[PDB]
Amino acid sequence: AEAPLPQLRAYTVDASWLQPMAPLQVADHTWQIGTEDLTALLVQTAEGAVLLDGGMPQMAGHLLDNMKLRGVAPQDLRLILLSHAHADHAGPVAELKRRTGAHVAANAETAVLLARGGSNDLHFGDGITYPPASADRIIMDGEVVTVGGIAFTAHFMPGHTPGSTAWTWTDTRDGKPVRIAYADSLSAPGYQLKGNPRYPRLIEDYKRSFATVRALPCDLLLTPHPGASNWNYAVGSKASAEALTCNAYADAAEKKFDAQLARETAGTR
Amino acid sequence: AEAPLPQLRAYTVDASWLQPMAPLQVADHTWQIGTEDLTALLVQTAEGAVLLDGGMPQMAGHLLDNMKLRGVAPQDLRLILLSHAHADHAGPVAELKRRTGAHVAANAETAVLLARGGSNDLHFGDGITYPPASADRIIMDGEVVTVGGIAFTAHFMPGHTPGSTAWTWTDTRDGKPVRIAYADSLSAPGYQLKGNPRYPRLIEDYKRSFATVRALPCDLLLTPHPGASNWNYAVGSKASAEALTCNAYADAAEKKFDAQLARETAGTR
Amino acid sequence: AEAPLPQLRAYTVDASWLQPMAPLQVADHTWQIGTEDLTALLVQTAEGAVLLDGGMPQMAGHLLDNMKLRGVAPQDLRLILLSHAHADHAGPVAELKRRTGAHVAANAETAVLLARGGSNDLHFGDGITYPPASADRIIMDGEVVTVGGIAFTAHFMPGHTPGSTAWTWTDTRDGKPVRIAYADSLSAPGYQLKGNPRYPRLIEDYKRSFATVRALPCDLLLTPHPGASNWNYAVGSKASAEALTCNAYADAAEKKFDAQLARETAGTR
Amino acid sequence: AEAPLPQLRAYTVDASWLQPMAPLQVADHTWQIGTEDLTALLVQTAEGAVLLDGGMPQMAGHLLDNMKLRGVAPQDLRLILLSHAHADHAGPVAELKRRTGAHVAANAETAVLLARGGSNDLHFGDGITYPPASADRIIMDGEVVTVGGIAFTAHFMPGHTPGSTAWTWTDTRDGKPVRIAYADSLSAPGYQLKGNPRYPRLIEDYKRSFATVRALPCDLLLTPHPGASNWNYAVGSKASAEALTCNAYADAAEKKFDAQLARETAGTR
Numbered sequence A, B, C, D: 001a002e003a004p005l006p007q008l009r010a011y012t013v014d015a016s017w018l019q020p021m022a023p024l025q026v027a028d029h030t031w032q033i034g035t036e037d038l039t040a041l042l043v044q045t046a047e048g049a050v051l052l053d054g055g056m057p058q059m060a061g062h063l064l065d066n067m068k069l070r071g072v073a074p075q076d077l078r079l080i081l082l083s084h085a086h087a088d089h090a091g092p093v094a095e096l097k098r099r100t101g102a103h104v105a106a107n108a109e110t111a112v113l114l115a116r117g118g119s120n121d122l123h124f125g126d127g128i129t130y131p132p133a134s135a136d137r138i139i140m141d142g143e144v145v146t147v148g149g150i151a152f153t154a155h156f157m158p159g160h161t162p163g164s165t166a167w168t169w170t171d172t173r174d175g176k177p178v179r180i181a182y183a184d185s186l187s188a189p190g191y192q193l194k195g196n197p198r199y200p201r202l203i204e205d206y207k208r209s210f211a212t213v214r215a216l217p218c219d220l221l222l223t224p225h226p227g228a229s230n231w232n233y234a235v236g237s238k239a240s241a242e243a244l245t246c247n248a249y250a251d252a253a254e255k256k257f258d259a260q261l262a263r264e265t266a267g268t269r
Ligand SMILES: C[C@H](CS)C(=O)N1CCC[C@H]1C(=O)O
Pocket: A114, A115, A132, A133, A134, B112, B113, B115, B116, B120, C111, C134, C135, C136, C137, C138
């Protein structure tokens, strides 16, 4: 009686990443509409809405529910933007496109990973996947995408994925501008950093990306994993109280990266 | 403490579907190289090999091992053909393409489902998925694909999937021709047959496909699930003893389909 | 001084195919907005517009101009449907998608040809091409697509292309229903009909498609080339006067097909 | 009698770009097999051949002819690499893939442009297009691709296109190593350089790419347009005599770029 091949293993996550929350207002037009521990930002304009990230694949219905609470019908969603195309951020994109008619704008690296459904990941292989989706517009570094007069600027910050992107826009609160920076992850979870044949310039890209994050226009920083920027979505009006600056987020990420690099030289993860 | 969204659920299968077996010769050039309960046929020519189906995603390494036992190095695999693009038959195609340089030939319906990784299935939704892969050649009904002088003919038999295909070729044994028919599944597992908005002509297609299977050139029938044609790969040289004819396979499938249709009218699965 | 390789040759067409016209009303909601000799139908609903075909690639701006004359802003175009994915009918689809955010719904055969930009055509090779575009929804035979409460039904009629489709919907005029049938081309221009290795069942498909066209619900027939159904868009309110029935269109196409088949047997085009 | 829309215009080129030539040996394994004025490099190994660029779409048959003269049958072509995905360098890729079974390896930017057939170009729009093709392997900056033991290293040099790549490998001649650098174009033909909304960091990318080219391992430089590196393929064994170094090629390109930038500030092309 010899061993059969192993069964496929599902991508399972902490319960808080799947815990629905009601819409939490970030600025006049901008709302967190994902789960307690995964960001999905809805930006509402007079000419339709923009969604930045959707979380896990199973979050599609919840996102549509929260859009409805905000007055956004499915067909009112015009545009989906992404931080990076891993299953816990781009998971429901294919379903959202089918149910809303929204288009996706992303850089070429994010587009190719999204079209693979996250398979053949440089570090994860086929372990963390989701339904594939197509990008409808390819964007370049620094390119501006505008919906309802609100301009979103892309800032490439490769490392966590080759296509990792920060998005910036200026909202308002109390009559004053609020420069929002939605910066992507700077983690390298389980990654081989040095001499990686699938990503030879990984270290150089991360190092440049720390600098890119430090330089973002940033009155208020948000991140795909809210804990990375010290947000606590579950506490409502105090959710943003402890939020990091872009400088502090980059500094923390670089210290962690440097320590991980030294541990890899020392033979451990 | 309210319920979080459910975790993703992996596509799990009976252990026998994942139980490796050594190559089992079907005819002079044709070998079963999959698992005990999933067909993957290797056809070896003087100018490279053809693979018809690969089974589950986790079978890629085993298939390459069996190819090596047959004298087929990875780069010797020229062509992948498919019965249908469900995860338990097309599962390892993307990985095989990357590791062998083989091309995929398939009809348009199979190509679109394969490129989705089986997501947005007409009946399964996103429940049964696999790494997406691209077809390199689109084939039409009755089209002949030739490798090393061996001609493979496609016979469309829509129903189980819109792109379901039977493949026929003539091998030899004991100096005599053996017309092999690799006919696709004719099951409708859990499908809504009547008035299905995603497949309005489902019943008409199945009915035509029973006739197509009856008419195949067929000295020896094989099926993606070997039990459907009464093969038992685990018993070696007796594996083919009880194999059905194409007529008998079509008849059994049609009786099951008609009974399921009546049960659906009677309100049950 | 030996001959260089030939220059690329552009797909050039009769001037009337490129001659802009103002919107011509077909029924209460339905307008011809293409050129004098290429159909592009705009169907306007309370929840956005549908475009059936766009003509040649250079027609994108003209279509948007005519949409504006009808009160349809670019973002109001929700859906693009196609008769078949040749350059003179799907030509501007990629550009329209980028400028409107519309989605494309098409069958798998049309989707694969559209994604090739018409290249590797079964009969034309690479001679007649256009910017590639992706389908966003794959439709099956008989499937209903609804926008603003108006239901469009797909009727597959393979032959002219494998993915050739007739679209039907019911509009109104003078308080009475008008069953509109937009039937695809039934021509085989320069095609090898018999024993075509790239389309082995071509004759069988055309023969079935003549029957499909005869059976369409049809108070008013329109065709991608208006002359094929005896429309004359240039004469305004008399444009539809001489229009054929579906029965007469199918009969004329079948007689032409049978004559061409006999000429092919007799060695001529 | 008002003007019809303009006819489509073919991409026409100088006759020398389409003038076939016999294979010209560059090093022990490496041959120029394109036309007098467009590079297409064949690298022949014990385990199959690599093609770097193919020229214009109409060059497919000529390339296959020259491969045959070199002893390379169609199925012996294993891999296609590209400098950049414009019609005059990637033109015949789709056809070559269909006729050889070769795979394409390219970066994400090149993959997305190739899959568009060069349409929606950042600078050319839809004016310069070719049959779309899919990449089979996505490569990263500095990644090594190996065929028959010969290692090809990718060096990203964005500017002329976002995906512009230099490829390096070490061949031999007279028992000594020859480090070959196939560097992409550094021209900006008709491009808006400053404040280009579709390429906001164009100038920064070109400036970094001049430095990348200067730093390439380079005993012998070749370029997609041979005149850019002072090759003259038509003079046979003297073809390489006047070839530039990488330093000189970068310097000439940067001086031209700086002059064009000043002219753009001065309001001219
Ligand atoms: C695989 C692609 C996304 S990358 C997809 O979902 N498509 C491509 C064509 C239509 C639609 C579908 O199959 O439903």
